[PDB]
Structures are given as C-alpha cells and as structure tokens.
Amino acid sequence: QRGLAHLVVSNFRAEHLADTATDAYLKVFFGGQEFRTGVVWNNNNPRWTDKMDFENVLLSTGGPLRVQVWDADAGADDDLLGSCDRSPHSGFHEVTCELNHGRVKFSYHAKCLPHLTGGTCLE
C-alpha cells in the first residue's frame, strides 16, 4: 500500500546532559513500537551504537517519531531529561533535540517501498 517506508533510526548520541553523574538511555517510539537503548553509565556525552529498525511504517500517519531522554540515576527512580517529536519524511535526515540541559542528536533513513515516491511515499 501507498505511504509505506522502511524506517531506520540510528547514530544516537547526546551531549552536556548535566561532576554530575549521568546514566542516560533513550526510549524511541513510532507507530506504537517502542525501542529502548542500553544505559550509558556515568557519562554526560553518551553515544549509543543501536540501530532501531521500525521496518515498514506509514510515514504520514505513524504519529510523530518520539524520542525521550531518561536518566537511570544509579538504578533509582528514572528521571525524564527531555523529549522531542519529529515528523519523518523520505530520505536521510539528521535531528537535534535541545533539552533542559544539553541535547540529543540522531539520524533516520526512511526509504519509500518500491514504486512509491514523495516525502510521505504517497505518489
């Protein structure tokens, strides 16, 4: 069907998230699917190696790509450091989400399924 794209979110990293110990991990959502990175313990500028392949998704209706930045805080209650919503479109795109402290950056690739074109793969 029209509007389908293979969506892969990757290249996650954050900077200046805080002497303050930061134990960050991400929660990434799209079309109801949730992925969680591992915790990078004790680092204000973490990098995660994860690729999050959402497989074939409806770009224009799969709600926004939502990224949440959480701090595990040595295992104690998790703190929400910030979140952002992006509307993905076909191609390769880099995202920067500013938080209360620092920012999270990532990339995504949305490749329209064969015989489809346009920003939301409807053509």
Side-chain angles (χ1 to χ4, degrees), residues 3-18 20-24:
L4 288 176
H6 174 194
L7 177 63
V8 178
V9 189
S10 64
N11 200 7
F12 302 100
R13 77 267 191 204
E15 59 188 56
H16 307 156
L17 288 189
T20 293
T22 299
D23 306 328

Side-chain angles (χ1 to χ4, degrees), residues 20-60:
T20 293
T22 299
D23 306 328
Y25 70 95
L26 306 176
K27 278 183 198 176
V28 175
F29 307 80
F30 195 89
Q33 297 181 59
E34 180 193 327
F35 284 90
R36 193 178 70 199
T37 68
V39 175
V40 176
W41 301 95
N42 192 53
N43 200 331
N44 291 333
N45 303 297
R47 74 184 300 266
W48 296 274
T49 54
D50 310 63
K51 274 208 280 178
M52 289 172 179
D53 192 335
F54 289 89
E55 312 302 336
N56 299 336
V57 304
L58 258 344
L59 279 191
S60 60

Side-chain angles (χ1 to χ4, degrees), residues 67 81 91 94 101:
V67 175
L81 294 176
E94 275 257 66
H101 294 280

Side-chain angles (χ1 to χ4, degrees), residues 86-123:
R86 290 298 181 270
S87 270
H89 51 104
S90 59
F92 167 53
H93 304 290
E94 275 257 66
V95 168
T96 298
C97 299
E98 292 296 328
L99 311 176
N100 189 239
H101 294 280
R103 63 209 47 85
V104 60
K105 290 170 158 168
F106 61 92
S107 295
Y108 73 81
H109 288 78
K111 178 74 176 62
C112 296
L113 286 225
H115 308 123
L116 299 168
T117 190
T120 54
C121 312
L122 299 167
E123 188 166 60

